[PDB]
Amino acid sequence: DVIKFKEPERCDYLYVDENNKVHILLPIVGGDEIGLDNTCQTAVELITFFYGSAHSGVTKYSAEHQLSEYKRQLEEDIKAINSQKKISPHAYDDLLKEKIERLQQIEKYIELIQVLKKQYDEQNDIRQLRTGGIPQLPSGVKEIIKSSENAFAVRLSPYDNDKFTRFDDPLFNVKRNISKYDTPSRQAPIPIYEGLGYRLRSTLFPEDKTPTPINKKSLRDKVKSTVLSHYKDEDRIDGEKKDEKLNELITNLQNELVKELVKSDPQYSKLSLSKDPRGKEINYDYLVNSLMLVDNDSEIGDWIDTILDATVDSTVWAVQASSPFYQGAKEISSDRDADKISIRVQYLLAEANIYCKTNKLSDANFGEFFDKEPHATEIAKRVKEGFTQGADIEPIIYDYINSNHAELGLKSPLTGKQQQEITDKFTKHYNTIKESPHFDEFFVADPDKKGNIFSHQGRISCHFLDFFTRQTKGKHPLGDLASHQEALQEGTSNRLHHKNEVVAQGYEKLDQFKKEVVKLLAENKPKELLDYLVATSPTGVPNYSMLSKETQNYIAYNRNWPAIQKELEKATSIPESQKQDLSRLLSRDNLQHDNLSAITWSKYSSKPLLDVELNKIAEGLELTAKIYNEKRGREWWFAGSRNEARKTQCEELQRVSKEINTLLQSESLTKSQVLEKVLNSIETLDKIDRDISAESNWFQSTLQKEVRLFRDQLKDICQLDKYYFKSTKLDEIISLEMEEQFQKIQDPAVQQIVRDLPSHCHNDEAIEFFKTLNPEEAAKVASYLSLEYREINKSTDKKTLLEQDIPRLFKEVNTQLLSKLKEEKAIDEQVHEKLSQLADKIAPEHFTRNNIIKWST
């Protein structure tokens, strides 16, 4: 007796634009703007899109299945709307239209995915994703990346490089060592002694083992150097005029602090060093005799230290943005450190190169220039210089670019604004990849520029149609989807919203409709209501097409109904077929009167599904283990030899993946089951990380950085509010914390009542009130609430006071009938006064003409 609308406001891979065009987006890599380099990255996204899982899963999470499910939900919603058409022909016409348009497009995309996989995969370009040991980007995808305007790969030169690069057309490329994977031992690479990478590494820490000092002093270290530049080693705050030298130093320090602050952030202009954060006045007595910190003849700097510590807040220090280059360390005192910075520098050059490419200033490969001499060595030197002096590293690089701006394919060098744009991107993106296992390559996207690459749901993606067109080589025409790619290009941005507002508005429009209906009834405006109900949409559909059990009752049982009924008869501007519709739907005295179904939609469809997200994690663990074992050679045979610790850890990853997988297989999944598996999985991953940490000895293990990533992902899942859950039992997307709150209602009859109630009755305060009731008290309240919109909070809501409020309203509503009957003379005064006493005790739904006739007899 309730219609539950099942089309979700969100679906993996599915974007719906403002003109209701369905766009499916094939993902290339996971991330926004930049995607991290991990053994499996590009793999996981594609594998999932095309097949639910590489193996050990159902086809449940593929694009085809997910779209087929979406398709089914629409068909259910359409069938439901149609069920209401028998009662009110216009019912939900706008929604029905929108839902049919999406249905038809969804169906077409599904055929294409079916077709592409069967007819146009003869070389096994898709298939290899799930079978081949190290999956490759498909051909279509590589073509899309090559031809892109807003997305590019950059290849870097870390010391321990990995030859299995996925991106074959980097914009930025530098010379790399011979990967350990091209050596027989497979344990360390063969270094090369030319190139930018070697020049940076060897310069920042040479084979003489002579460290490079990192002397960065700011901002307090800087201010203390500038203020002490004017003072001597000897002078104290002593002599006859001790308060005056103090006050001068406080003013001088104050001035220099606000001066270096505004340069960094002009917004801390009115700060005082003459009073502490409490509000008490800073003076000689206060620092020497009340706190005891600074004695008499204390040094100038210790006075400065203490003034600062007493007056300044802890937040302000370190307030200014920090370069990725300055991580805090004293000096570059090992090889590990040198590579961290080699890569940092390389990545900055990569980022500048990217800026210059997306902005059409150059088409060149900056790395092809900086690997050549003298440039390789000269930039490595200037950087080492810079670190010792503590200077800003970023401009050193920009200056050298400007110094050779023509050689790098630019007409003008980089402006000060352009330079800051680059620096800030470099900062954002480096911090994202700071803890990447690998630094071989990175795919970077710009969604604020036009091109063939997009950003949707935390995936960097291409249009599925672009990939399809290309994979089939133009053979299968798109039919009605042939204009769709264009349509998306024609958009405002390439950064697409994670949820689909067009769908969400479909429902919000219904909510808005009841809200108005509720308002106009409370303001007792029957003529405006009737006008609002016949008012049309741009498609000409009258507003009464959004009537449902809730609103139909609100009107039918209202005091303004007789006024509304009169307005209805006495009106000419409204066609008779709607004039009947309305009287049929809202006059309970009409013999053709029939009740519409109640209407609901999920309040949590816009959130990512728990199971979908877990699947991605399981899938990622499997892949990692698989491509890891496929990257070792020629040592496949048992056994270690220390083989087990590396190998039993990989067995441990699969164990987790299998377990998460079997967790998902279960229907009737509960908050506590999920939480329990997820922590037990987190702990296993934690032990693995711990086992590695001890072993050393000491080398940074890529696997450690990989398990950390997976643990974090699983930690994110424990915030179950951020996800929704498909209940297979009730076929609806719910929240596990709403089911918690519903379950916390003891008695099953009361609980069900509360569930069947409108959304306004599903808040926390309300369910507490309702659990102080019994099944008979509950149904009385339910009926009560169906008569006129009221909110139940704790305050002000009294169970007793409510049992006076119900009777009042029952009696008021039912009198409408009795007064009508005695005016008609359809009842004796015998039964009029007998019923008039009964009026406050009988639910209006049961207080009807037939019932009275039956009742008297």
PDB file of N, CA and C in Angstrom, residues 377-425:
ATOM      1  N   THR A 377      73.187  19.126 -14.681  1.00  0.00           N
ATOM      2  CA  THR A 377      74.070  19.391 -13.556  1.00  0.00           C
ATOM      3  C   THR A 377      73.818  20.770 -12.952  1.00  0.00           C
ATOM      4  N   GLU A 378      73.500  21.734 -13.800  1.00  0.00           N
ATOM      5  CA  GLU A 378      73.392  23.116 -13.344  1.00  0.00           C
ATOM      6  C   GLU A 378      72.186  23.281 -12.408  1.00  0.00           C
ATOM      7  N   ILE A 379      71.055  22.680 -12.771  1.00  0.00           N
ATOM      8  CA  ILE A 379      69.870  22.717 -11.906  1.00  0.00           C
ATOM      9  C   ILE A 379      70.072  21.912 -10.609  1.00  0.00           C
ATOM     10  N   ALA A 380      70.790  20.792 -10.689  1.00  0.00           N
ATOM     11  CA  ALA A 380      71.126  19.992  -9.495  1.00  0.00           C
ATOM     12  C   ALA A 380      71.978  20.781  -8.508  1.00  0.00           C
ATOM     13  N   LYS A 381      72.844  21.637  -9.050  1.00  0.00           N
ATOM     14  CA  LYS A 381      73.750  22.447  -8.250  1.00  0.00           C
ATOM     15  C   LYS A 381      72.998  23.594  -7.568  1.00  0.00           C
ATOM     16  N   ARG A 382      72.278  24.375  -8.369  1.00  0.00           N
ATOM     17  CA  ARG A 382      71.474  25.488  -7.857  1.00  0.00           C
ATOM     18  C   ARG A 382      70.521  25.058  -6.741  1.00  0.00           C
ATOM     19  N   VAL A 383      69.987  23.845  -6.857  1.00  0.00           N
ATOM     20  CA  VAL A 383      69.112  23.291  -5.837  1.00  0.00           C
ATOM     21  C   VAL A 383      69.896  22.996  -4.550  1.00  0.00           C
ATOM     22  N   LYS A 384      71.061  22.361  -4.673  1.00  0.00           N
ATOM     23  CA  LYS A 384      71.881  22.080  -3.498  1.00  0.00           C
ATOM     24  C   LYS A 384      72.269  23.386  -2.818  1.00  0.00           C
ATOM     25  N   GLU A 385      72.699  24.364  -3.611  1.00  0.00           N
ATOM     26  CA  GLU A 385      72.975  25.711  -3.100  1.00  0.00           C
ATOM     27  C   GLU A 385      71.777  26.199  -2.300  1.00  0.00           C
ATOM     28  N   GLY A 386      70.622  26.231  -2.970  1.00  0.00           N
ATOM     29  CA  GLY A 386      69.379  26.721  -2.387  1.00  0.00           C
ATOM     30  C   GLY A 386      69.040  26.124  -1.038  1.00  0.00           C
ATOM     31  N   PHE A 387      69.227  24.812  -0.890  1.00  0.00           N
ATOM     32  CA  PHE A 387      68.913  24.101   0.363  1.00  0.00           C
ATOM     33  C   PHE A 387      69.779  24.556   1.530  1.00  0.00           C
ATOM     34  N   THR A 388      71.066  24.747   1.250  1.00  0.00           N
ATOM     35  CA  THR A 388      72.048  25.196   2.243  1.00  0.00           C
ATOM     36  C   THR A 388      71.710  26.605   2.747  1.00  0.00           C
ATOM     37  N   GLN A 389      71.326  27.455   1.806  1.00  0.00           N
ATOM     38  CA  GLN A 389      70.951  28.818   2.110  1.00  0.00           C
ATOM     39  C   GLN A 389      69.523  28.940   2.645  1.00  0.00           C
ATOM     40  N   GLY A 390      68.732  27.871   2.526  1.00  0.00           N
ATOM     41  CA  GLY A 390      67.342  27.851   3.005  1.00  0.00           C
ATOM     42  C   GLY A 390      66.346  28.602   2.134  1.00  0.00           C
ATOM     43  N   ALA A 391      66.742  28.897   0.898  1.00  0.00           N
ATOM     44  CA  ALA A 391      65.899  29.654  -0.024  1.00  0.00           C
ATOM     45  C   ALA A 391      64.717  28.840  -0.564  1.00  0.00           C
ATOM     46  N   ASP A 392      63.748  29.553  -1.124  1.00  0.00           N
ATOM     47  CA  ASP A 392      62.609  28.926  -1.765  1.00  0.00           C
ATOM     48  C   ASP A 392      63.073  28.217  -3.022  1.00  0.00           C
ATOM     49  N   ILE A 393      62.791  26.919  -3.059  1.00  0.00           N
ATOM     50  CA  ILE A 393      63.287  26.044  -4.096  1.00  0.00           C
ATOM     51  C   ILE A 393      62.544  26.287  -5.408  1.00  0.00           C
ATOM     52  N   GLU A 394      61.223  26.394  -5.314  1.00  0.00           N
ATOM     53  CA  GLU A 394      60.357  26.469  -6.489  1.00  0.00           C
ATOM     54  C   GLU A 394      60.825  27.529  -7.504  1.00  0.00           C
ATOM     55  N   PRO A 395      61.101  28.785  -7.054  1.00  0.00           N
ATOM     56  CA  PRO A 395      61.573  29.842  -7.987  1.00  0.00           C
ATOM     57  C   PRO A 395      62.927  29.577  -8.642  1.00  0.00           C
ATOM     58  N   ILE A 396      63.795  28.853  -7.954  1.00  0.00           N
ATOM     59  CA  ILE A 396      65.072  28.472  -8.538  1.00  0.00           C
ATOM     60  C   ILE A 396      64.803  27.794  -9.875  1.00  0.00           C
ATOM     61  N   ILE A 397      63.914  26.802  -9.839  1.00  0.00           N
ATOM     62  CA  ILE A 397      63.497  26.041 -11.026  1.00  0.00           C
ATOM     63  C   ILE A 397      62.821  26.930 -12.079  1.00  0.00           C
ATOM     64  N   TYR A 398      61.892  27.784 -11.642  1.00  0.00           N
ATOM     65  CA  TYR A 398      61.179  28.667 -12.576  1.00  0.00           C
ATOM     66  C   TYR A 398      62.161  29.627 -13.274  1.00  0.00           C
ATOM     67  N   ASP A 399      63.157  30.109 -12.531  1.00  0.00           N
ATOM     68  CA  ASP A 399      64.161  31.021 -13.088  1.00  0.00           C
ATOM     69  C   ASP A 399      64.927  30.338 -14.208  1.00  0.00           C
ATOM     70  N   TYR A 400      65.371  29.109 -13.960  1.00  0.00           N
ATOM     71  CA  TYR A 400      66.115  28.344 -14.964  1.00  0.00           C
ATOM     72  C   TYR A 400      65.276  28.053 -16.202  1.00  0.00           C
ATOM     73  N   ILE A 401      63.973  27.867 -16.008  1.00  0.00           N
ATOM     74  CA  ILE A 401      63.048  27.711 -17.133  1.00  0.00           C
ATOM     75  C   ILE A 401      62.999  29.001 -17.952  1.00  0.00           C
ATOM     76  N   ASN A 402      62.786  30.125 -17.269  1.00  0.00           N
ATOM     77  CA  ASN A 402      62.771  31.441 -17.916  1.00  0.00           C
ATOM     78  C   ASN A 402      64.082  31.737 -18.644  1.00  0.00           C
ATOM     79  N   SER A 403      65.197  31.423 -17.983  1.00  0.00           N
ATOM     80  CA  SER A 403      66.533  31.544 -18.579  1.00  0.00           C
ATOM     81  C   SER A 403      66.668  30.812 -19.911  1.00  0.00           C
ATOM     82  N   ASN A 404      65.856  29.782 -20.136  1.00  0.00           N
ATOM     83  CA  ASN A 404      65.893  29.020 -21.380  1.00  0.00           C
ATOM     84  C   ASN A 404      64.513  28.877 -21.989  1.00  0.00           C
ATOM     85  N   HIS A 405      63.659  29.862 -21.744  1.00  0.00           N
ATOM     86  CA  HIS A 405      62.253  29.730 -22.089  1.00  0.00           C
ATOM     87  C   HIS A 405      62.001  29.457 -23.580  1.00  0.00           C
ATOM     88  N   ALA A 406      62.859  29.961 -24.457  1.00  0.00           N
ATOM     89  CA  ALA A 406      62.696  29.731 -25.893  1.00  0.00           C
ATOM     90  C   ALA A 406      63.048  28.290 -26.256  1.00  0.00           C
ATOM     91  N   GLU A 407      64.096  27.775 -25.627  1.00  0.00           N
ATOM     92  CA  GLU A 407      64.538  26.400 -25.852  1.00  0.00           C
ATOM     93  C   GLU A 407      63.487  25.379 -25.421  1.00  0.00           C
ATOM     94  N   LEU A 408      62.619  25.774 -24.485  1.00  0.00           N
ATOM     95  CA  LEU A 408      61.549  24.922 -23.965  1.00  0.00           C
ATOM     96  C   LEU A 408      60.213  25.142 -24.701  1.00  0.00           C
ATOM     97  N   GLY A 409      60.268  25.828 -25.836  1.00  0.00           N
ATOM     98  CA  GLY A 409      59.131  25.906 -26.738  1.00  0.00           C
ATOM     99  C   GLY A 409      58.124  26.954 -26.338  1.00  0.00           C
ATOM    100  N   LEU A 410      58.558  27.928 -25.534  1.00  0.00           N
ATOM    101  CA  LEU A 410      57.713  29.041 -25.074  1.00  0.00           C
ATOM    102  C   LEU A 410      58.081  30.354 -25.764  1.00  0.00           C
ATOM    103  N   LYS A 411      57.091  31.223 -25.961  1.00  0.00           N
ATOM    104  CA  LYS A 411      57.305  32.519 -26.611  1.00  0.00           C
ATOM    105  C   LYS A 411      57.717  33.563 -25.566  1.00  0.00           C
ATOM    106  N   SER A 412      56.980  33.624 -24.464  1.00  0.00           N
ATOM    107  CA  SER A 412      57.353  34.459 -23.324  1.00  0.00           C
ATOM    108  C   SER A 412      57.693  33.530 -22.154  1.00  0.00           C
ATOM    109  N   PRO A 413      58.549  33.991 -21.230  1.00  0.00           N
ATOM    110  CA  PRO A 413      58.764  33.207 -20.016  1.00  0.00           C
ATOM    111  C   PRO A 413      57.556  33.261 -19.076  1.00  0.00           C
ATOM    112  N   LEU A 414      57.671  32.603 -17.932  1.00  0.00           N
ATOM    113  CA  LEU A 414      56.550  32.460 -17.005  1.00  0.00           C
ATOM    114  C   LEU A 414      56.428  33.684 -16.115  1.00  0.00           C
ATOM    115  N   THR A 415      55.231  34.276 -16.061  1.00  0.00           N
ATOM    116  CA  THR A 415      54.970  35.412 -15.156  1.00  0.00           C
ATOM    117  C   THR A 415      54.904  34.984 -13.681  1.00  0.00           C
ATOM    118  N   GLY A 416      54.939  35.965 -12.780  1.00  0.00           N
ATOM    119  CA  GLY A 416      54.909  35.704 -11.336  1.00  0.00           C
ATOM    120  C   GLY A 416      53.614  35.047 -10.887  1.00  0.00           C
ATOM    121  N   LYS A 417      52.537  35.347 -11.612  1.00  0.00           N
ATOM    122  CA  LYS A 417      51.230  34.769 -11.356  1.00  0.00           C
ATOM    123  C   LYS A 417      51.212  33.318 -11.831  1.00  0.00           C
ATOM    124  N   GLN A 418      51.621  33.116 -13.092  1.00  0.00           N
ATOM    125  CA  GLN A 418      51.787  31.772 -13.688  1.00  0.00           C
ATOM    126  C   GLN A 418      52.643  30.866 -12.805  1.00  0.00           C
ATOM    127  N   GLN A 419      53.736  31.405 -12.285  1.00  0.00           N
ATOM    128  CA  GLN A 419      54.588  30.663 -11.379  1.00  0.00           C
ATOM    129  C   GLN A 419      53.887  30.237 -10.096  1.00  0.00           C
ATOM    130  N   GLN A 420      53.013  31.071  -9.560  1.00  0.00           N
ATOM    131  CA  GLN A 420      52.309  30.707  -8.322  1.00  0.00           C
ATOM    132  C   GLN A 420      51.240  29.635  -8.604  1.00  0.00           C
ATOM    133  N   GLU A 421      50.566  29.758  -9.748  1.00  0.00           N
ATOM    134  CA  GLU A 421      49.610  28.745 -10.195  1.00  0.00           C
ATOM    135  C   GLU A 421      50.271  27.345 -10.218  1.00  0.00           C
ATOM    136  N   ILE A 422      51.429  27.261 -10.865  1.00  0.00           N
ATOM    137  CA  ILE A 422      52.175  26.027 -10.926  1.00  0.00           C
ATOM    138  C   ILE A 422      52.534  25.556  -9.520  1.00  0.00           C
ATOM    139  N   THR A 423      53.105  26.436  -8.701  1.00  0.00           N
ATOM    140  CA  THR A 423      53.553  26.023  -7.369  1.00  0.00           C
ATOM    141  C   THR A 423      52.431  25.410  -6.543  1.00  0.00           C
ATOM    142  N   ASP A 424      51.235  25.977  -6.671  1.00  0.00           N
ATOM    143  CA  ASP A 424      50.104  25.569  -5.853  1.00  0.00           C
ATOM    144  C   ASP A 424      49.552  24.228  -6.304  1.00  0.00           C
ATOM    145  N   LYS A 425      49.498  23.995  -7.618  1.00  0.00           N
ATOM    146  CA  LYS A 425      49.186  22.657  -8.167  1.00  0.00           C
ATOM    147  C   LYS A 425      50.209  21.622  -7.731  1.00  0.00           C
TER     148      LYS A 425
END
